[PDB]
Design a protein around this ligand. Structure first.
Ligand SMILES: CC(=O)N[C@H]1[C@@H](OP(=O)(O)OP(=O)(O)OC[C@H]2O[C@@H](n3ccc(=O)[nH]c3=O)[C@H](O)[C@@H]2O)O[C@H](CO)[C@@H](O)[C@@H]1O
Ligand SMILES: CC(=O)N[C@H]1[C@@H](OP(=O)(O)OP(=O)(O)OC[C@H]2O[C@@H](n3ccc(=O)[nH]c3=O)[C@H](O)[C@@H]2O)O[C@H](CO)[C@@H](O)[C@@H]1O
Ligand SMILES: CC(=O)N[C@H]1[C@@H](OP(=O)(O)OP(=O)(O)OC[C@H]2O[C@@H](n3ccc(=O)[nH]c3=O)[C@H](O)[C@@H]2O)O[C@H](CO)[C@@H](O)[C@@H]1O
Ligand SMILES: [Ca+2]
Ligand SMILES: [Ca+2]
Ligand SMILES: [Ca+2]
Ligand SMILES: [Ca+2]
Lengths: 255, 255, 255
């Protein structure tokens, strides 16, 4: 199960039922859980923390030092949870002193060439398309869908259930449940396909849609819009999430 | 010729005069033809079918399972023909039950980082630029030129002799002989440079140009335009290909 | 320091205090200087020339033959200087007969997936973001900052101290000290953040800003603008560099 043509530092901690292919390189100060599959020519570097049930494809590089020139050799980690699919040549750099941990959650698919920068946070259940670049200290909430070649600026946040269209770029927050597309990026309606696939009721979908008609299409500033959403849209956890996300948005939200 | 520092599963079928570098990983259920060169740290995975006379550069990954979450472990292949240049970190995933075979033809150049998704079809004589992403079940006809960082949506088709400009994205079909550029993508004239390089007559080039003036610049709907092309442009296989491609376009064509 | 699980051709010239990880592949006709660190699964190919004090991350490929189909097997090199950071899956192809040497200078950071084409020239002190593609025979002057997913057309030149925003593409020259952004790309003001960080005086910054107000915002053609800059902006090496760069621009400059 562990190929003798892998390089595995004696100090690496490796769980049970782990398959390691030839030409895998595993450093010291590495923790790997159970039921992982690490394919040929992958690199698991100093500071990596891997959970259970993941598949790491050829050429993936987990734990390299930050690309941030402010890095000065401080201790940090690069972490993934359980049941993720980490495709070919995906890079997940370890953290900087700004946070100290780059973290990916559970049940994500990071397609080939995806980059996860120092101190980034990915939740659970996300799909991130080919060669998308997530810059320093970003946050992706659960259940987001990001297409290929997306550029997410540092410090931004993406809400749950969004679909970001391929090739888009953005340097503001993207609030939950929306489609973000075009150049420059813009609110492009609700992710109705995603929400219907996930079994959201037509009524909840319509409420979400009405909240965003208020936010984006009623000529109201952000405070007034959120007031009106709170007054006029039948309340539910989904509507509270919209409101809370926007009200506390660190960057502001996209147009 | 075959490095002893390569890993080659005993069941892999390997032809004559094949050069395999150190740290190449070749799985079972692999067929490789004659006169291939496979460079260091390349991966040829379960289900790969490789023809003759190819060069596979370092870090290329052929045959990994689809990125489609609908994949359920069905048998499939990833295939390349003869005389291709498969550059660094090119990914060619094997197929899904939707078709079952990802196929690249002969005499293509897939530049570094190019992704070929499950069930895609590439013809012959194509050039595909750095990190271009071809999504599921796409079709590329012979002799196309696609620049770098292009995003081709699933189920789309690209006709012969096109030039798609760098960074463009599209989710409709691109008809033969044209330049497609800008954002949003658009018909940008004829690929006269390509056609002149390939020895097309000035007369045939002018006919093609006239067909597309009718299609794109005469205010006609698609049916009327194609009627008029068939009536007024001197007929040739090139003009029939334009007409047939557009008339049977599954997605519609770009604007 | 040199792993016995690396492949190193006996003819490769390797300097002192060089750390080489497992699964590194080093060819013949390679020169590597002192104090280098070459990480696992990197490839240093025929014709590579590496200076001192560099770090080459996993999956980087230095020296592969040009992607230019005009290449006919001529001798050429791929070269990097001193103190560079060459990140994961960076590709630096060797040259063609058009020049014969692909050259990267000193103290650069080439982030993951960056491509450096045949015969390209990179200076010193540059930062080039994730997966940026530099096409054939380009030139990057010292101290440039290029963000991620940038496409630089062949034969173009980028001046010092620019910031090119993420996802931009361009096929004209970019003159020194500016921000280039948007689609289509455009002059977007001065790189004041960069210049202030590097300790430029507020007075020199204001002069630069005034030169570009003349060039871009005064309705003057290029000759008249440069005449007026030479007459009205207090002279300094920075202003002479602006003027000289534009006056001798091979492609013309961006709008
Ligand atoms: C991660 C995954 O499994 N992706 C697969 C999935 O893509 P995906 O489900 O995106 O593709 P489909 O072609 O099924 O989707 C139809 C349309 O719905 C859109 N859409 C989809 C989901 C969503 O939450 N919001 C939304 O707006 C898509 O962008 C597309 O325009 O099916 C494709 C077609 O079989 C496959 O090639 C992809 O590999
Ligand atoms: C695959 C290949 O060999 N590419 C090489 C080729 O590019 P390519 O032939 O594209 O480059 P050139 O600079 O020769 O082309 C001149 C112009 O014609 C355009 N054009 C080209 C072909 C076409 O079918 N349609 C069209 O519109 C190009 O985009 C460019 O704007 O020459 C460049 C300059 O030596 C090299 O760096 C590239 O590596
Ligand atoms: C190579 C490097 O060390 N990059 C790091 C640096 O990026 P960088 O310095 O680019 O990031 P900052 O967030 O510090 O910059 C603030 C703003 O200034 C802009 N700007 C920056 C420099 C410049 O010359 N011109 C200019 O216009 C940036 O694009 C940004 O919009 O700090 C980020 C935030 O800690 C880190 O995640 C990056 O890894
Ligand atoms: Ca606040
Ligand atoms: Ca790689
Ligand atoms: Ca039909
Ligand atoms: Ca001249």
């Amino acid at each position: 199960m562990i190929s003798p043509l892998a390089y595995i530092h004696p100090e690496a901690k490796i769980g049970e039922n782990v398959e390691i292919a030839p030409f895998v390189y595993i450093d010291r100060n590495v923790v790997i859980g159970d039921n992982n599959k690490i394919m040929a020519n992958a690199n698991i570097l100093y500071g990596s923390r891997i959970g259970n049930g993941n598949t790491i494809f050829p050429g993936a590089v987990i734990g390299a030092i930050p690309q941030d020139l402010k890095f000065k050799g401080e201790e940090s980690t690069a972490e993934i949870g359980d049941n993720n699919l980490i495709r070919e040549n995906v890079t997940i750099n370890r953290g900087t002193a700004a946070k100290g941990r780059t973290i990916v959650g559970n049940n994500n698919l990071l397609m080939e060439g995806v980059h996860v920068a120092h101190d980034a946070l990915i939740g659970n259940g996300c799909i991130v398309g080919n060669s998308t670049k997530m810059a320093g200290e970003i946050i992706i909430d659960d259940n987001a869908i990001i297409s290929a070649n997306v550029l997410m600026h540092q410090f931004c946040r993406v809400g749950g259930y969004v679909m970001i269209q391929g090739g888009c770029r953005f340097s503001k927050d993207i609030p939950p449940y929306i489609i973000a597309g075009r150049e420059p990026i813009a609110y492009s309606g609700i992710n109705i396909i995603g929400l219907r696939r996930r079994g959201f009721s037509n009524e909840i979908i319509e409420n979400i849609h009405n909240a965003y008609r208020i936010i984006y299409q009623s000529g109201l500033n952000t405070s007034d819009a959120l007031t009106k959403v709170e007054a006029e849209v039948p309340a539910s956890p989904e509507i509270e999430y919209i409101v809370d996300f926007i009200r506390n948005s660190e960057r502001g939200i996209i147009r």
